[PDB]
Amino acid sequence: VHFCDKCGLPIKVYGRMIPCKHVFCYDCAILHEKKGDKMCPGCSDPVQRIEQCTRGSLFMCSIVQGCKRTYLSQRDLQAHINHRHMRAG
Ligand SMILES: [Zn+2]
Ligand SMILES: [Zn+2]
Ligand SMILES: [Zn+2]
């Protein structure tokens, strides 16, 4: 994503979080890890490990609602559509 989901500021680096597979600002994403070490900035999920990536290394999904399940290969993001959207309905 561009604007951090927790800070809203323009993400300069893709702070990827696992196993959520969610992205944020690798800067505020690490401050959160140093804060709880296991809570996504917005999903508050067990942040296993945060990693930095380029704003072109993940694939954002845009089907309906706020589905921002990024991935590492269109095949996984495509697999996300048929796994949770299935043509929406
Ligand atoms: Zn931020
Ligand atoms: Zn998350
Ligand atoms: Zn989706």
Side-chain angles (χ1 to χ4, degrees), residues 34-79:
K34 278 152 165 52
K35 203 87 208 85
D37 217 58
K38 46 138 183 221
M39 71 205 282
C40 213
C43 338
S44 182
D45 251 39
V47 180
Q48 167 145 266
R49 126 178 274 202
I50 319 190
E51 304 186 277
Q52 82 201 100
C53 253
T54 9
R55 51 136 45 71
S57 330
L58 315 184
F59 302 73
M60 302 226 80
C61 151
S62 176
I63 294 272
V64 60
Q65 216 195 100
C67 203
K68 302 245 177 177
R69 289 270 158 80
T70 15
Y71 288 95
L72 347 180
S73 276
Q74 208 82 99
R75 176 254 301 285
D76 271 280
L77 170 136
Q78 195 298 289

Short mmCIF file of all heavy atoms in Angstrom, two decimals, residues 34-79:
data_model
loop_
_atom_site.label_atom_id
_atom_site.label_comp_id
_atom_site.label_asym_id
_atom_site.label_seq_id
_atom_site.Cartn_x
_atom_site.Cartn_y
_atom_site.Cartn_z
N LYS A 34 8.77 -3.24 18.11
CA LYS A 34 9.51 -2.89 19.35
C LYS A 34 8.50 -2.57 20.44
O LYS A 34 8.80 -2.60 21.61
CB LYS A 34 10.40 -1.67 19.09
CG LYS A 34 11.70 -2.11 18.43
CD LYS A 34 12.25 -0.97 17.57
CE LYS A 34 13.71 -1.26 17.21
NZ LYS A 34 13.81 -2.62 16.61
N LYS A 35 7.29 -2.27 20.05
CA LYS A 35 6.25 -1.94 21.05
C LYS A 35 5.65 -3.22 21.63
O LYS A 35 5.62 -3.42 22.83
CB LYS A 35 5.14 -1.11 20.39
CG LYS A 35 4.40 -0.31 21.45
CD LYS A 35 5.11 1.03 21.68
CE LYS A 35 4.87 1.50 23.11
NZ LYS A 35 5.87 0.86 24.02
N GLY A 36 5.16 -4.09 20.78
CA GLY A 36 4.55 -5.37 21.26
C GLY A 36 5.36 -6.56 20.74
O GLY A 36 5.44 -7.59 21.37
N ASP A 37 5.97 -6.42 19.60
CA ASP A 37 6.77 -7.54 19.04
C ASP A 37 5.85 -8.67 18.59
O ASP A 37 6.28 -9.78 18.35
CB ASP A 37 7.72 -8.07 20.12
CG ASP A 37 9.05 -8.46 19.48
OD1 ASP A 37 9.67 -7.61 18.87
OD2 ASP A 37 9.44 -9.61 19.62
N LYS A 38 4.57 -8.41 18.47
CA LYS A 38 3.64 -9.48 18.05
C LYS A 38 2.24 -8.92 17.81
O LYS A 38 1.25 -9.57 18.10
CB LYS A 38 3.58 -10.51 19.15
CG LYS A 38 3.43 -9.80 20.50
CD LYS A 38 2.40 -10.53 21.37
CE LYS A 38 2.20 -9.76 22.67
NZ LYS A 38 2.10 -10.72 23.81
N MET A 39 2.13 -7.73 17.29
CA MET A 39 0.77 -7.16 17.04
C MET A 39 0.78 -6.29 15.78
O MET A 39 1.48 -5.30 15.70
CB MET A 39 0.34 -6.31 18.24
CG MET A 39 1.16 -5.03 18.30
SD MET A 39 1.22 -4.42 20.00
CE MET A 39 -0.43 -3.68 20.04
N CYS A 40 0.01 -6.67 14.79
CA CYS A 40 -0.03 -5.88 13.53
C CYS A 40 -0.55 -4.46 13.84
O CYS A 40 -1.46 -4.31 14.63
CB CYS A 40 -0.98 -6.56 12.54
SG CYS A 40 -0.39 -6.30 10.85
N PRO A 41 0.00 -3.42 13.25
CA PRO A 41 -0.46 -2.03 13.50
C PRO A 41 -1.98 -1.90 13.45
O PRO A 41 -2.57 -1.14 14.20
CB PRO A 41 0.17 -1.22 12.37
CG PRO A 41 1.39 -1.97 11.98
CD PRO A 41 1.11 -3.44 12.27
N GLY A 42 -2.61 -2.62 12.56
CA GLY A 42 -4.10 -2.53 12.43
C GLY A 42 -4.75 -3.90 12.69
O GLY A 42 -5.82 -3.99 13.26
N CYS A 43 -4.12 -4.96 12.26
CA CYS A 43 -4.72 -6.31 12.47
C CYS A 43 -4.38 -6.83 13.86
O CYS A 43 -4.97 -7.78 14.34
CB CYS A 43 -4.18 -7.27 11.41
SG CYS A 43 -3.57 -6.31 10.00
N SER A 44 -3.44 -6.22 14.53
CA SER A 44 -3.07 -6.69 15.89
C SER A 44 -2.89 -8.21 15.87
O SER A 44 -3.22 -8.90 16.82
CB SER A 44 -4.18 -6.32 16.88
OG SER A 44 -3.81 -6.74 18.18
N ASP A 45 -2.37 -8.74 14.80
CA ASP A 45 -2.16 -10.21 14.72
C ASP A 45 -0.76 -10.54 15.25
O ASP A 45 0.09 -9.69 15.33
CB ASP A 45 -2.27 -10.66 13.26
CG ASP A 45 -3.56 -11.46 13.07
OD1 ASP A 45 -4.57 -11.07 13.65
OD2 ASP A 45 -3.53 -12.44 12.35
N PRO A 46 -0.53 -11.77 15.62
CA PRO A 46 0.80 -12.20 16.16
C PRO A 46 1.94 -11.91 15.17
O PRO A 46 2.47 -12.80 14.54
CB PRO A 46 0.63 -13.71 16.41
CG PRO A 46 -0.58 -14.12 15.65
CD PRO A 46 -1.48 -12.89 15.56
N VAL A 47 2.31 -10.66 15.02
CA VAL A 47 3.41 -10.32 14.08
C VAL A 47 4.59 -11.28 14.30
O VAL A 47 5.38 -11.10 15.21
CB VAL A 47 3.87 -8.89 14.31
CG1 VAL A 47 4.99 -8.54 13.34
CG2 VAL A 47 2.69 -7.95 14.10
N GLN A 48 4.72 -12.28 13.47
CA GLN A 48 5.85 -13.24 13.64
C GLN A 48 7.15 -12.50 13.35
O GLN A 48 7.99 -12.35 14.22
CB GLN A 48 5.69 -14.41 12.67
CG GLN A 48 6.99 -15.21 12.62
CD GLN A 48 6.67 -16.70 12.45
OE1 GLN A 48 6.58 -17.42 13.42
NE2 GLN A 48 6.49 -17.19 11.25
N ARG A 49 7.32 -12.03 12.15
CA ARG A 49 8.57 -11.29 11.83
C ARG A 49 8.29 -10.24 10.75
O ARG A 49 7.65 -10.52 9.76
CB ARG A 49 9.65 -12.28 11.38
CG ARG A 49 10.23 -11.90 10.01
CD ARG A 49 11.34 -12.89 9.64
NE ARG A 49 12.63 -12.43 10.22
CZ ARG A 49 13.76 -12.85 9.72
NH1 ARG A 49 13.76 -13.67 8.71
NH2 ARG A 49 14.89 -12.45 10.24
N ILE A 50 8.77 -9.05 10.93
CA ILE A 50 8.54 -8.00 9.91
C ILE A 50 9.71 -7.95 8.95
O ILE A 50 10.84 -8.18 9.32
CB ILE A 50 8.41 -6.64 10.58
CG1 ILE A 50 7.60 -6.80 11.86
CG2 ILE A 50 7.73 -5.66 9.63
CD1 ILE A 50 7.23 -5.43 12.43
N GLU A 51 9.43 -7.65 7.73
CA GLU A 51 10.50 -7.57 6.71
C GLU A 51 10.25 -6.39 5.78
O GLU A 51 9.13 -5.99 5.56
CB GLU A 51 10.53 -8.87 5.91
CG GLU A 51 10.71 -10.04 6.89
CD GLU A 51 10.90 -11.34 6.10
OE1 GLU A 51 9.90 -11.92 5.71
OE2 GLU A 51 12.04 -11.73 5.91
N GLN A 52 11.30 -5.83 5.25
CA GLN A 52 11.14 -4.66 4.34
C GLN A 52 11.11 -5.13 2.88
O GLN A 52 11.71 -6.13 2.53
CB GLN A 52 12.31 -3.69 4.53
CG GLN A 52 13.52 -4.18 3.73
CD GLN A 52 14.80 -3.57 4.30
OE1 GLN A 52 15.51 -4.22 5.04
NE2 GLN A 52 15.11 -2.35 4.00
N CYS A 53 10.42 -4.43 2.03
CA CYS A 53 10.35 -4.84 0.60
C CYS A 53 10.13 -3.61 -0.28
O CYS A 53 9.82 -2.54 0.20
CB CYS A 53 9.19 -5.81 0.41
SG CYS A 53 9.83 -7.49 0.18
N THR A 54 10.28 -3.76 -1.56
CA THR A 54 10.07 -2.60 -2.47
C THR A 54 8.57 -2.42 -2.71
O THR A 54 7.80 -3.35 -2.55
CB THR A 54 10.78 -2.85 -3.80
OG1 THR A 54 11.24 -4.20 -3.84
CG2 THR A 54 11.98 -1.91 -3.94
N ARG A 55 8.15 -1.25 -3.09
CA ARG A 55 6.69 -1.04 -3.32
C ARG A 55 6.28 -1.67 -4.64
O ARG A 55 5.31 -1.28 -5.27
CB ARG A 55 6.38 0.46 -3.35
CG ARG A 55 7.34 1.16 -4.32
CD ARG A 55 6.56 2.15 -5.18
NE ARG A 55 5.62 2.93 -4.32
CZ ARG A 55 6.09 3.82 -3.48
NH1 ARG A 55 7.38 4.03 -3.40
NH2 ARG A 55 5.27 4.50 -2.73
N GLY A 56 6.99 -2.67 -5.06
CA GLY A 56 6.65 -3.37 -6.33
C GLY A 56 6.96 -4.85 -6.15
O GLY A 56 7.03 -5.60 -7.09
N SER A 57 7.18 -5.26 -4.92
CA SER A 57 7.51 -6.68 -4.66
C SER A 57 6.25 -7.46 -4.25
O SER A 57 6.22 -8.67 -4.32
CB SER A 57 8.54 -6.76 -3.53
OG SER A 57 9.35 -5.59 -3.55
N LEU A 58 5.23 -6.77 -3.82
CA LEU A 58 3.97 -7.46 -3.40
C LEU A 58 2.86 -7.17 -4.41
O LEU A 58 2.96 -6.27 -5.22
CB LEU A 58 3.55 -6.95 -2.03
CG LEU A 58 4.76 -6.89 -1.10
CD1 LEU A 58 4.30 -6.47 0.29
CD2 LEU A 58 5.41 -8.27 -1.02
N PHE A 59 1.79 -7.93 -4.36
CA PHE A 59 0.65 -7.71 -5.30
C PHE A 59 -0.60 -7.37 -4.50
O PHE A 59 -1.11 -8.18 -3.75
CB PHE A 59 0.42 -8.98 -6.13
CG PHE A 59 1.69 -9.33 -6.86
CD1 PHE A 59 2.78 -9.87 -6.17
CD2 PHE A 59 1.78 -9.12 -8.25
CE1 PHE A 59 3.95 -10.20 -6.85
CE2 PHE A 59 2.95 -9.45 -8.93
CZ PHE A 59 4.04 -9.99 -8.23
N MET A 60 -1.10 -6.17 -4.63
CA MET A 60 -2.31 -5.77 -3.86
C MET A 60 -3.59 -6.29 -4.53
O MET A 60 -3.68 -6.34 -5.75
CB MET A 60 -2.38 -4.24 -3.78
CG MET A 60 -1.11 -3.71 -3.11
SD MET A 60 -1.55 -2.47 -1.87
CE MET A 60 -2.03 -3.62 -0.56
N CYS A 61 -4.56 -6.66 -3.75
CA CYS A 61 -5.85 -7.18 -4.32
C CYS A 61 -6.91 -6.09 -4.20
O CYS A 61 -6.95 -5.35 -3.24
CB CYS A 61 -6.30 -8.41 -3.53
SG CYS A 61 -8.10 -8.52 -3.57
N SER A 62 -7.77 -5.98 -5.18
CA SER A 62 -8.84 -4.94 -5.13
C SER A 62 -10.14 -5.51 -5.69
O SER A 62 -10.55 -5.19 -6.79
CB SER A 62 -8.41 -3.73 -5.97
OG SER A 62 -9.47 -2.78 -6.00
N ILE A 63 -10.80 -6.35 -4.94
CA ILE A 63 -12.08 -6.95 -5.42
C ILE A 63 -13.26 -6.22 -4.77
O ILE A 63 -14.08 -5.62 -5.44
CB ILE A 63 -12.13 -8.43 -5.03
CG1 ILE A 63 -11.03 -9.19 -5.78
CG2 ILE A 63 -13.49 -9.02 -5.37
CD1 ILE A 63 -11.55 -9.67 -7.14
N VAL A 64 -13.35 -6.26 -3.47
CA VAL A 64 -14.47 -5.57 -2.78
C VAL A 64 -14.09 -5.30 -1.32
O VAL A 64 -13.10 -5.80 -0.83
CB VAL A 64 -15.72 -6.46 -2.82
CG1 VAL A 64 -15.42 -7.78 -2.12
CG2 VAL A 64 -16.87 -5.75 -2.10
N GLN A 65 -14.87 -4.51 -0.63
CA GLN A 65 -14.55 -4.22 0.79
C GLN A 65 -13.08 -3.80 0.91
O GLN A 65 -12.46 -3.40 -0.06
CB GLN A 65 -14.79 -5.47 1.64
CG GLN A 65 -15.33 -5.07 3.01
CD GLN A 65 -15.21 -6.26 3.97
OE1 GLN A 65 -14.30 -6.32 4.77
NE2 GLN A 65 -16.10 -7.21 3.92
N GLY A 66 -12.52 -3.89 2.09
CA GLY A 66 -11.09 -3.50 2.27
C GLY A 66 -10.21 -4.74 2.18
O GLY A 66 -9.50 -5.08 3.11
N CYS A 67 -10.24 -5.43 1.07
CA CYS A 67 -9.39 -6.65 0.93
C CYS A 67 -7.99 -6.25 0.48
O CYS A 67 -7.72 -6.09 -0.69
CB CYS A 67 -10.02 -7.59 -0.11
SG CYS A 67 -9.45 -9.28 0.18
N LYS A 68 -7.08 -6.10 1.42
CA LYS A 68 -5.69 -5.72 1.07
C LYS A 68 -4.76 -6.90 1.33
O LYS A 68 -3.66 -6.74 1.82
CB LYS A 68 -5.25 -4.53 1.93
CG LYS A 68 -6.22 -3.36 1.71
CD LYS A 68 -5.46 -2.20 1.05
CE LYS A 68 -6.44 -1.06 0.77
NZ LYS A 68 -5.70 0.10 0.20
N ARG A 69 -5.18 -8.09 1.01
CA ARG A 69 -4.31 -9.28 1.25
C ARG A 69 -3.21 -9.32 0.20
O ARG A 69 -3.38 -9.85 -0.88
CB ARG A 69 -5.15 -10.56 1.17
CG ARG A 69 -6.07 -10.64 2.39
CD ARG A 69 -5.36 -11.39 3.51
NE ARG A 69 -5.97 -11.02 4.82
CZ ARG A 69 -7.09 -11.59 5.20
NH1 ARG A 69 -7.66 -12.47 4.43
NH2 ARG A 69 -7.63 -11.27 6.34
N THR A 70 -2.06 -8.76 0.50
CA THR A 70 -0.95 -8.77 -0.49
C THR A 70 -0.34 -10.17 -0.57
O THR A 70 -0.71 -11.06 0.17
CB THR A 70 0.14 -7.79 -0.06
OG1 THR A 70 -0.06 -7.42 1.29
CG2 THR A 70 0.09 -6.54 -0.95
N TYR A 71 0.60 -10.36 -1.45
CA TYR A 71 1.25 -11.69 -1.57
C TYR A 71 2.61 -11.52 -2.26
O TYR A 71 3.08 -10.41 -2.43
CB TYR A 71 0.37 -12.63 -2.40
CG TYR A 71 -0.83 -13.02 -1.58
CD1 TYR A 71 -2.03 -12.31 -1.71
CD2 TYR A 71 -0.75 -14.09 -0.68
CE1 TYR A 71 -3.15 -12.68 -0.95
CE2 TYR A 71 -1.86 -14.46 0.09
CZ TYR A 71 -3.06 -13.75 -0.05
OH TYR A 71 -4.16 -14.11 0.71
N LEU A 72 3.25 -12.60 -2.61
CA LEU A 72 4.59 -12.51 -3.26
C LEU A 72 4.50 -12.91 -4.73
O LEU A 72 5.43 -12.72 -5.49
CB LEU A 72 5.57 -13.46 -2.54
CG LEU A 72 4.97 -13.95 -1.22
CD1 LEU A 72 5.96 -14.88 -0.52
CD2 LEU A 72 4.68 -12.75 -0.31
N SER A 73 3.40 -13.47 -5.14
CA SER A 73 3.27 -13.87 -6.57
C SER A 73 1.81 -13.80 -6.99
O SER A 73 0.93 -14.27 -6.29
CB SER A 73 3.78 -15.30 -6.74
OG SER A 73 5.19 -15.28 -6.91
N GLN A 74 1.54 -13.21 -8.12
CA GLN A 74 0.13 -13.11 -8.59
C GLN A 74 -0.57 -14.45 -8.37
O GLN A 74 -1.75 -14.51 -8.12
CB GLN A 74 0.11 -12.76 -10.08
CG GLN A 74 -1.17 -11.99 -10.41
CD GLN A 74 -0.99 -10.51 -10.03
OE1 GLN A 74 -0.71 -9.69 -10.88
NE2 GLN A 74 -1.14 -10.15 -8.79
N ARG A 75 0.15 -15.52 -8.47
CA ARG A 75 -0.46 -16.87 -8.28
C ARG A 75 -1.02 -17.00 -6.86
O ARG A 75 -2.00 -17.68 -6.63
CB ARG A 75 0.62 -17.93 -8.48
CG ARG A 75 0.05 -19.31 -8.18
CD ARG A 75 0.59 -19.81 -6.84
NE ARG A 75 2.07 -19.87 -6.89
CZ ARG A 75 2.67 -20.82 -7.54
NH1 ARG A 75 1.97 -21.74 -8.16
NH2 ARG A 75 3.98 -20.87 -7.59
N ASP A 76 -0.41 -16.35 -5.91
CA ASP A 76 -0.91 -16.45 -4.51
C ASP A 76 -2.03 -15.44 -4.32
O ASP A 76 -3.01 -15.68 -3.64
CB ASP A 76 0.23 -16.14 -3.54
CG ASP A 76 0.98 -17.43 -3.20
OD1 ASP A 76 0.49 -18.18 -2.37
OD2 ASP A 76 2.03 -17.65 -3.79
N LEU A 77 -1.91 -14.31 -4.96
CA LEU A 77 -2.96 -13.29 -4.85
C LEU A 77 -4.13 -13.75 -5.69
O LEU A 77 -5.27 -13.55 -5.35
CB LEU A 77 -2.43 -11.96 -5.39
CG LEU A 77 -3.57 -10.96 -5.52
CD1 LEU A 77 -3.11 -9.61 -4.99
CD2 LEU A 77 -3.95 -10.84 -7.00
N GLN A 78 -3.85 -14.41 -6.77
CA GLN A 78 -4.96 -14.92 -7.60
C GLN A 78 -5.63 -16.00 -6.79
O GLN A 78 -6.84 -16.14 -6.75
CB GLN A 78 -4.42 -15.51 -8.91
CG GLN A 78 -5.57 -15.69 -9.90
CD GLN A 78 -6.60 -16.68 -9.36
OE1 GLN A 78 -6.34 -17.86 -9.27
NE2 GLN A 78 -7.77 -16.24 -8.98
N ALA A 79 -4.81 -16.75 -6.13
CA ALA A 79 -5.34 -17.82 -5.28
C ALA A 79 -6.12 -17.18 -4.14
O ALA A 79 -6.97 -17.80 -3.54
CB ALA A 79 -4.18 -18.65 -4.71
#
